[PDB]
Amino acid sequence: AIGKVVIKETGEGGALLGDAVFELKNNTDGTTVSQRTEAQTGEAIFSNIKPGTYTLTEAQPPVGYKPSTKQWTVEVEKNGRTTVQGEQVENREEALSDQYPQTGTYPDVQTPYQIIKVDGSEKNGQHKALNPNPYERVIPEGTLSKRIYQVNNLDDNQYGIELTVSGKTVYEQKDKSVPLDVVILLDNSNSMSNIRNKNARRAERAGEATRSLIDKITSDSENRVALVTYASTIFDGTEFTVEKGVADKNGKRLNDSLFWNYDQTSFTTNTKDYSYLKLTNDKNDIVELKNKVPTEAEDHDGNRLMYQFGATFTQKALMKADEILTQQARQNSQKVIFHITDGVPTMSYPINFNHATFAPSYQNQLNAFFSKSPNKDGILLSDFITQATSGEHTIVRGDGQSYQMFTDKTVYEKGAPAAFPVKPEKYSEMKAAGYAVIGDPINGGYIWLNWRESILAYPFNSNTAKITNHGDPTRWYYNGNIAPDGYDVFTVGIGINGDPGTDEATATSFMQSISSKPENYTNVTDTTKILEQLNRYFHTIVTEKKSIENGTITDPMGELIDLQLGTDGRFDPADYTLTANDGSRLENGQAVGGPQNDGGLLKNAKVLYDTTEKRIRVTGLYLGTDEKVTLTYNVRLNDEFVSNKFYDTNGRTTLHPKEVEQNTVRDFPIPKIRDVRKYPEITISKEKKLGDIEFIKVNKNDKKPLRGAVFSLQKQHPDYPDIYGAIDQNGTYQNVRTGEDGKLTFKNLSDGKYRLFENSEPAGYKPVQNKPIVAFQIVNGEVRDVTSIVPQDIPAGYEFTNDKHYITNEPIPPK
Ligand SMILES: [Ca+2]
Ligand SMILES: [Ca+2]
Ligand SMILES: [Mg+2]
Structure with a gap:
């Protein structure tokens, strides 16, 4: 239901030809479908061709053009791949369909997740790839994630894949x-x-x-x-x-700080x-x-x-x-x-x-x-x-x-009891407020300091x-x-x-x-x-x-998804990356780096690839909170894809958080990729067809063939209408003398108007000296309007009998 082939026909130097008619017939069932070269585009298109083997034939060519002697074989594979056997063709761009699946389902707990178009995969209004959304999943052990993170080569269906796992x-x-x-x-x-x-x-x-x-x-x-x-x-x-603050010796409180007044x-x-x-x-x-x-x-x-x-x-x-x-x-x-x-x-x-x-x-x-x-x-x-x-x-x-x-109330400074100084200008004020000021209004004075009651030992x-x-x-x-x-x-x-x-x-x-x-x-x-x-x-x-303790990721490639192993065709450190967010990495297969420079989170991690199972495993994961590992690798859609069809990039992708618990399995979400197959276009160069016509010169009475008559075929001059002349200047169809079969055979004739002249009758026949006999036209390489132009009373004639054009001569009668 998905094979396709297109046929174009060219002619005149290389202009496109309309109205050709083709037939496609199934070589096991005999069934036929026929198609006609369409008007605007100049193409004849067979769609929806089922798996199997076909013969393609030109039933009719365009008007003006020779038929084709050639029959083509057309195989359509089980996947809709259309080949025209032993033939050069252009493969033409096909448009992608507008069909997308919208959800996947996590096998482990059976819940749907959404699927969205991947940016960078757009091809002519449609998309070639889909990611889960979100691509990161919360799990009891932390988080996991799987996505296409880059398109490596869109036309060649090459993508980069990323998996991450973070612990708890x-x-x-x-x-x-x-x-x-x-x-x-x-x-x-x-x-x-x-x-x-x-x-x-x-x-x-x-x-x-x-x-x-x-x-x-x-x-x-x-x-x-x-x-x-x-x-x-x-x-x-x-x-x-x-x-x-402190206090004077009668316990009256005062703040001795220079940042504040004494009553603060x-x-x-x-x-x-x-x-x-x-x-x-x-x-x-x-x-x-x-x-x-x-x-x-x-x-x-x-x-x-x-x-x-x-x-x-x-x-x-x-x-x-x-x-x-x-x-x-x-x-x-x-x-x-x-x-x-x-x-x-x-x-x-x-x-x-x-x-x-x-x-x-x-x-x-x-x-x-x-x-x-x-x-x-x-x-x-x-x-x-x-x-x-x-x-x-x-x-x-x-x-x-x-x-x-303190068990001594006295504040000490410099080895002696400490006093708050009272300048002459403050003496009256501090004395009136009730402090035990020693001194006088002229010289000022001082207030002996003690720690306040609440700072001392008690009782x-x-x-x-x-x-x-x-x-x-x-x-x-x-x-x-x-x-x-x-x-x-x-x-x-x-x-x-x-x-x-x-x-x-x-x-x-x-x-x-x-x-x-x-x-x-x-x-x-x-x-x-x-x-x-x-x-x-x-x-x-x-x-x-x-939560992740000697955990394993198991990651089978999907049907028709090939892991890129590069030219060596062997899985090796060039084909993947494995890094972790402590700055550790696998480098040429060995875990290096991390803050203790011992391989860090990847110290025991290995990336393996089982060639029989087409499956990557990552073993030896040990991750707590804020510890995260990333795996990347490249894939390509396999050449045998079905056109328009979305393929999962992976089979069931799983994290076992602990090798100790073999039945605790968490699913990763799964991306999809597709492509649309190109179709074959045959271009046929057609040959303009040329006219042919044959006359038999005969005896009028018994219709036997006559040897020795001479005729010349004239052609109308392209410019002047009343003016027929030789065909070319070589000697073509000028003075053609009939043989024993009587035949005058003309072929390879261009379009236009023609006049056949009898130059001379054969011996034994009434003279006919340079007389017009027959008119006809060649149009689209066919003979048209074959008519007698013999003048009145001339003894030659034209007749059309039993499918043959005859020119008659009358024998000289008894003297
Ligand atoms: Ca208590
Ligand atoms: Ca490799
Ligand atoms: Mg402190």
């Missing part, structure tokens, strides 16, 4: 049915400022590490995360007040909102939470208001993590805190000592507090003051000055127990209210050395005591290794497994 990293808890509920506590104190610490980039690196840890925790959709950012308070967007003893503002105080596993919420992670801290000194909020109130942060897990964690979940900090506490909530007259000794009081804690080693939250109607700043201990709570005059640093209460807080809960608590310190107010050994002991075991604190000195350390602690509670 899976974290599994020691108990699968127990997901994680995680709070991250993140220090945003001023010391985290990126330019501080010799440009250590603390904030940005701890922030980038936090974001990456969130990605790892939440890659399992069951796990939930929350984020607490802290410094002098929880950074949550709410309005907050801090106090600053408190600061109020909204903090930045760097917290996400809700455990969540919703993807949109997680996006929002990671955007709240700070990558800066306050860069300026104390001339900025926000600097006043950037000390280290560790207890309050630990409190917020315990609150979130207590209030929001699931019953059956592993509860975790990751705490990233760069300093020891410099603020804490006061232990609620009783100062009434008959109250027990401070040590007795404290021992009773320890006695209520679960492990007899800490203080319950209800035995601290953590709220006040006048505000937190009125009860909190410390302000960022030191880990110590300050105790003869028994006395709290002298912010670590002890924070640690007792932890032991009393966090340790009995069974949380995993990991602490990553950044450059911790005990500044301000203590040393590296106390700082280390303290950070260990607010982690769930001492190994669960690590101090990082290189800020580029914060993520590595968070990751290490992550890996004590999960095991990591890659």
Whole structure:
């Protein structure tokens, strides 16, 4: 139903000829179809020719032209390939059909995918190739993809094919049915400022590490995360007040900073909102939470208001993590805190000592507090003051000055008690405001400085127990209210050395005591290794497994699709590429490169080609999240294609993510290519036909043939009408003398008007001396209008009898 052959006829030098008539007959059934050279195009076209062998014959030629003595053989193959046997022809461009399949179906789970036209495959308004869309498929193990990624040679049906595979990293808890509920506590104190610490980039690196840890925790959709950012308070967007400054010896407060007036003893503002105080596993919420992670801290000194909020109130942060897990964690979940900090506490909530007259000794009081804690080693939250109607700043201990709570109220400078200078012009004002000014209005004076009450040890005059640093209460807080809960608590310190107010050994002991075991604190000195350390602690509670583990791609070529092996006809490294996104590659069959220069992701990958099965396999794939391999190779549509028909480039194309699981198979989507077969066009050069006509000279009476008559054939002159002359100047058909058969035979005669003259009768016949006998015309090489022109009474005649032209002579009668 798909064979085709076209015949053109030329003539006059080479102009195109109309009206020819052809026949195509099937040599096994005898069936016939006939076709006529069409009017405008000058072509005779046979369409829709079925497989088999044919004879093609010219039934009639155009008017004017000789018939053809030639019969052509026409074989149509099972695929519609039309050949005219042992004959030179032009093969002509054929138009592509407008039929396209619209979908493929994934065998594995039986779902449709769309199919679209490939750019660069357009040929005259139609397309030769189709890609799946999308060409990349999401799978539980990552993604896979297959497409034509380039057209190498459109006219020759040559394309480049690309397959990719990307993996997934899976974290599994020691108990699968127990997901994680995680709070991250993140220090945003001023010391985290990126330019501080010799440009250590603390904030940005701890922030980038936090974001990456969130990605790892939440890659399992069951796990939930929350984020607490802290410094002098929880950074949550709410309005907050801090106090600053020192005091004179009667306790009248004053800010000795040169950035502020002496009466600026408190600061109020909204903090930045760097917290996400809700455990969540919703993807949109997680996006929002990671955007709240700070990558800066306050860069300026104390001339900025926000600097006043950037000390280290560790207890309050630990409190917020315990609150979130207590209030929001699931019953059956592993509860975790990751705490990233760069300093020891410099603020804490006061232990609620009783100062009434008959109250027990401070040590007795404290021992009773320890006695209520679960492990007899800490203080319950209800035995601290953590709220006040006048505000937190009125009860909190410390302000960022030191880990110590000073046991001497005196501020020292240069080896001696320090005084605030009061110039003569401020003497009256500071004296009237109620400060203990020493000096006078002429010379000015000074105000001896003391640390304010809330920065000192308390109870300050105790003869028994006395709290002298912010670590002890924070640690007792932890032991009393966090340790009995069974949380995993990991602490990553950044450059911790005990500044301000203590040393590296106390700082280390303290950070260990607010982690769930001492190994669960690590101090990082290189800020580029914060993520590595968070990751290490992550890996004590999960095991990591890659989803593609000695995976295999199996990629059979489609029916009538040939893998390009180039001239050697052998599959070798010139015929494919295999690269991966760690920069590794197969090079001459060997895996090279990657950041460790060991072949990286491709270290164990092989590309094989089974020549019997026409199939590529890629073995040895090991891929986690963001690990991706690419295979490319070239194919060509086989010469035996069926015209217009789309061929899949591959058979069933599969990824087995794990050789360990032989029945887990994922399908790749499949491209298609086609071509339209050219048809044979025979051009026939036709010969103009020329006229012929024969007369028999005979006796009038008995119609016997006569020898010895002489005739001349005249032709009308092309210019003048009344004027017949010789045909050429050689001697052609001039004085032709008849033989015993009587025949006058004319052939190869051009078109036009002719007059046959009898020059002389034969011996024994009435004289006929140069007389016109017959007129006729040759038109389109045929004899027309054969008429007698014998003059009246001349004894010659013309007769037409039993299909023959006769010229008669009358014998001389008896004397
Ligand atoms: Ca608790
Ligand atoms: Ca090769
Ligand atoms: Mg700090």
